[PDB]
Enzyme design. Sequence first.
Site, PDB file in Angstrom:
ATOM      1  N   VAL B  15      48.560  41.993  52.755  1.00 23.90           N
ATOM      2  CA  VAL B  15      49.927  42.494  52.821  1.00 23.90           C
ATOM      3  C   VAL B  15      50.206  43.360  51.595  1.00 23.90           C
ATOM      4  CG1 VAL B  15      52.373  41.852  52.879  1.00 23.90           C
ATOM      5  CG2 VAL B  15      50.679  40.428  54.059  1.00 23.90           C
ATOM      6  N   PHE B  18      52.799  45.957  47.998  1.00 21.40           N
ATOM      7  CA  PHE B  18      53.275  47.078  48.798  1.00 21.40           C
ATOM      8  C   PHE B  18      52.058  47.768  49.411  1.00 21.40           C
ATOM      9  CE2 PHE B  18      52.520  51.523  47.761  1.00 21.40           C
ATOM     10  CZ  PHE B  18      51.738  51.417  46.633  1.00 21.40           C
ATOM     11  N   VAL B  21      45.440  45.637  51.113  1.00 15.97           N
ATOM     12  CA  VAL B  21      44.203  45.115  50.552  1.00 15.97           C
ATOM     13  C   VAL B  21      43.176  44.976  51.666  1.00 15.97           C
ATOM     14  CG1 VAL B  21      43.068  43.127  49.506  1.00 15.97           C
ATOM     15  CG2 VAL B  21      45.295  43.888  48.647  1.00 15.97           C
ATOM     16  N   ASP B 130      56.320  34.943  41.066  1.00 17.68           N
ATOM     17  CA  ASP B 130      55.857  34.872  42.457  1.00 17.68           C
ATOM     18  C   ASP B 130      54.604  34.004  42.586  1.00 17.68           C
ATOM     19  OD1 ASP B 130      56.277  35.384  45.156  1.00 17.68           O
ATOM     20  OD2 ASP B 130      55.017  37.185  45.157  1.00 17.68           O
TER      21      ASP B 130
END
Lengths: 69, 402, 21, 301
Positions: B15, B18, B21, B130
């Site tokens: 994902v 931004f 991958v 995160d």
Amino acid sequence: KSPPILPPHLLQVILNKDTNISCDPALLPEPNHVMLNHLYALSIKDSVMVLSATHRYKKKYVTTLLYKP
Amino acid sequence: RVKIGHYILGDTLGVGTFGKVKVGKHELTGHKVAVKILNRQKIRSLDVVGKIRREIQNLKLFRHPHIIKLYQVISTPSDIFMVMEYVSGGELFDYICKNGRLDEKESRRLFQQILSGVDYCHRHMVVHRDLKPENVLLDAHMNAKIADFGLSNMMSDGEFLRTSCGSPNYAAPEVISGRLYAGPEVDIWSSGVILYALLCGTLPFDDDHVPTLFKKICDGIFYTPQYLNPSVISLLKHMLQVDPMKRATIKDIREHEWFKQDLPKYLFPEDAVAYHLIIDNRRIMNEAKDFYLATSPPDSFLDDHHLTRPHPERVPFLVAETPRAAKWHLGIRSQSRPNDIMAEVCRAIKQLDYEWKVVNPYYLRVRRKNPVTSTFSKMSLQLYQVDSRTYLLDFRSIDDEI
Amino acid sequence: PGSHTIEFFEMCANLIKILAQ
Amino acid sequence: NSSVYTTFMKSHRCYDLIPTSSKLVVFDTSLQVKKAFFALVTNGVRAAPLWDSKKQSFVGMLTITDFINILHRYYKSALVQIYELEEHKIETWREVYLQDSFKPLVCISPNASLFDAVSSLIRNKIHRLPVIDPESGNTLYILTHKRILKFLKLFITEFPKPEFMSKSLEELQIGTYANIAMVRTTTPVYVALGIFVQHRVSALPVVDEKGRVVDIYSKFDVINLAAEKTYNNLDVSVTKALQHRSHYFEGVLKCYLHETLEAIINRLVEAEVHRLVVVDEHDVVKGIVSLSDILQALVLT
Ligand SMILES: Nc1ncnc2c1ncn2[C@@H]1O[C@H](COP(=O)(O)O)[C@@H](O)[C@H]1O
Ligand SMILES: Nc1ncnc2c1ncn2[C@@H]1O[C@H](COP(=O)(O)O)[C@@H](O)[C@H]1O
């Protein structure tokens, strides 16, 4: 936009904290990195100002105290 | 197909913060790597030039068993490729749903490895915002590896962070309330809710209605149901303390009786060929900590008599002030109007011939030239609020290496 | 050539001298 | 014999002795000297670097010896208030005492060897040694013989134990055994300070009428006069000026000539004390083995 609320970390003064009587009189507890460089002071009495800050050297810490007319 | 050297890119699996991958496959040996793709067309459009620069900076010097390694970073005139270590198994977020929660045997083992990496990050002055089960990946041998450092930030001494960038859940209350923080405590809180999902299979703070969700967080309440072992509940209540000062530290977790249970010793510090002697000398230093650090005095103040051996070089000061019997302030405080204060501090600065520069309406960068050694000494003035009618002027020191 | 830390203290004193009343 | 402690002190730097977190007191030279002595008691410290705000640099140390020198010097005795101490700044007293006794500031780099530290201690005959950062100009710590021997005891395996460690003091010939400066039980405090001035020793063993040690008046026990503000009556005896510890002092630390050097060293670091009083069967003081003597026998085996 108001000036930011003071973070509680700065309200932990190592010099107001008292050490163990068995320990060397010069030793202090390990400080966190965030209290470093910040200026601490005593209540101005007579005509002598008592400033204080904690600074790091490599991985050693030293809390310097200064008496000044 | 686009190839990087001998690595042909295939299945998209990321994902990203931004940017996609993909998996890289070595055309000669089939070796698998993970490639984070960042085209210049997208990043340049924003002001994230320093943000991903910050991510790469932190990750570049990391080398830990439970943190995804950044092997290389290759630039083209069109895109930027972050070549990382590939692991198969995906997030442990998918290790939940599959299986039935996790045993105390298993959930702890992962928590140990994950925490080991968190420690490693903080030791390198790198906090990782995160920090969620989606950013923790597993290899073939089911070992946890911390991944996305897009929201990470390098901690600087004497400086707090703010920003508030984490997930809706997993985010500490001081973060969601947009208040400045040190760094690590925010990471602890994220780990605290991670350990919950590993033991329960669900989140401690969740709500479809988001504003009512942030309320469920800032209030330190959560349920530890039925089977949940009492030893680990005390750890959760500790790791999820709304008050950041009472919140657990890594030090407080390493010595916790639940976390000590059967953890590999290779995690954490303990345990031209002087490196085998410099590593030996260090162990002897931490062994006798009483030589380098001052311990904390006993807590009870209700004891009739207290017997203990006093250091010989602190007896006269002791026996005189204690037989039958000043606070340090932080900067200075006033009760004046905040902007009226800033007006007067510049007057004092102008009165001393100092070079000041405004960063915020309540943040200066004052510079002085020493009229003896001609050396420039710097310091930062930041105004805070303490009471509902009292403000605090903070004095910070700035070192400058050339 | 002078202590960086003391210089920091020296500077703060000059400021507070004015501010403190 | 020669070369294992030498090699050890030559391999480690001064930085290793520095505590991971300690406290350092610094006085401005324009501060009143009596105010400074109280500040020593305040923070529980013996010495403080002196900052000349006019010169923008450190200029020396303010130790307990200064307090002793102030008192012995300006002692209008005794009921008339000591005037030269009440109204007297540090800088103004360094214009008097330091003159005809000029000992310029001796410091050392953190990256400097531990060997040169011990070497600097003995070569300069000073008990303090400000470890000063060459860049920034910050003082990091004040080095002592006590701190060095402790670290020495701490950071060495006695598998390559030298010979002399298992040998007695009589044969090793370590310590002072001639003209031992000491005071009687009844000896006035003022007289003790005068001994401290001319002999310049770190302590004075208190002997009875038989010449047997019953206590010890170290230079450190002088700030008690500053701690209790009883510094104006120096007529009193040493034993009365040492009453402040009283029953809480467990006895005077001694040693014998027939016990090994290791025995002496081990006993000396457990006590956290500067010197041991050499004594015979009948507790008659016959010598003094100080940390100065021991560390000298390690730099020069
Ligand atoms: N009271 C004393 N009388 C005679 N010699 C002493 C006395 N105190 C210390 N010394 C010697 O003086 C040197 C330095 O001692 P110190 O001042 O304790 O470091 C060493 O050689 C000691 O043995
Ligand atoms: N030989 C000794 N026996 C007992 N106490 C001592 C001895 N030498 C010094 N002290 C005490 O140890 C403390 C520190 O003094 P110093 O030895 O100069 O570091 C003071 O309270 C002294 O009175």
